[PDB]
Amino acid sequence: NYSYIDPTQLPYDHKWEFPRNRLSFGKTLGAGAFGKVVEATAQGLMTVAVKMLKPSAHSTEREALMSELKVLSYLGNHENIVNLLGACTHGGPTLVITEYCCYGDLLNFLRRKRDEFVPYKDFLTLEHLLSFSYQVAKGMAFLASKNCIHRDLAARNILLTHGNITKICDFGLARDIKRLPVKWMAPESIFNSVYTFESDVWSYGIFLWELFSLGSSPYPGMPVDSKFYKMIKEGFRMSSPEYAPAEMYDIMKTCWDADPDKRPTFKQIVQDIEKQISES
Ligand SMILES: CN(C)[C@@](C)(c1ccc(F)cc1)c1cnc(N2CCN(c3ncnn4cc(-c5cnn(C)c5)cc34)CC2)nc1
């Protein structure tokens, strides 16, 4: 007589419905063979992003897009996620309208800032990197508090907008807890297809390594092959990235514990980074 409420089973909430012909589409923000995200103007909702599938997409991607709409509808608003603003469902393919983040993804932002960075006007600083790590931890703590896992946390899925605010995007693989980004995945996810709050924490560790290397690719010179899998399973881990303070590398190392039970929670990570910020 007692059941979990699965957000993907709930009905669409028509409060999100927006007239389709009041969108005016602009530049491409992301694209693949079966879908794209475009900038648009939305009369009566301002600048927004619109996620949509291409006519070649199969029914599985279409179901996945509606599921993502339903997860975002359930989660509610948070400063550190790219929030749902509206949807178009009647008489056409699903359009998911989200917030537009004017500075794009953090991976590309960090990479173009390498010549304008001090590791301590218009410069990226260590204070900014600490802030970004704090905000992403706050956003992931929010997801976990709603029993949600993201499953593709990476610097490429963190966007930057005004006020130096970072926002987690792309909830297409996000799941409620009752082809794959292998180098960001926890070993139990690779080996046993198991995803948990603790495997999101592993990915956050990889994200921190990206952050404090200003966007370097993880495990450089190590292709995904049988040798990569054995080395991760037997305990190989990346070294401290070049700009990480010792306290942040300590967080990374615990995020990468082979035992999920020994990894920190996002709530614990938030409180850790909070103490580091106050010490500054
Ligand atoms: C990977 N998948 C396979 C797809 C293709 C997909 C899957 C299913 C679909 F049905 C449709 C598409 C995909 C999903 N997601 C995204 N990204 C793109 C970035 N995007 C943004 N969202 C809000 N604002 N914003 C501002 C900027 C910005 C500002 N300056 N510059 C230079 C860029 C970028 C964004 C968030 C999501 N791209 C591709």
Residue numbers in the entry: 567 to 611, 618 to 692, 761 to 818, 830 to 931
What does the report in the manuscript say about this coordinate set?
Avapritinib is the only potent and selective inhibitor approved for the treatment of D842V-mutant gastrointestinal stromal tumors (GIST), the most common primary mutation of the platelet-derived growth factor receptor α (PDGFRA). Against this background, we solve the crystal structures of avapritinib in complex with wild-type and mutant PDGFRA and stem cell factor receptor (KIT), which provide evidence and understanding of inhibitor binding and lead to the identification of a sub-pocket (Gα-pocket). Furthermore, we report the identification of a sub-pocket (Gα-pocket) located in the N-lobe of the kinase domain, which is surrounded by amino acids of key regulatory elements such as the Gly-rich loop and the αC-helix.
In general, all derivatives with modifications of the primary amine demonstrated strong inhibitory activities. To our delight, we were able to obtain co-crystal structures at high resolutions for each of the inhibitors 8-12 bound to KIT-wt (1.5–2.0 Å) and 9 bound to PDGFRA-T674I (2.6 Å). While the biochemical evaluation still revealed IC50 values in the sub-nanomolar range, blocking the ability for proton donation through H-bonding by double methylation was accompanied by a slight loss of potency by 3–5-fold. Lower inhibitory activity was observed in KIT cell lines for both alkylated derivatives 8 and 9 compared to PDGFRA cell lines.
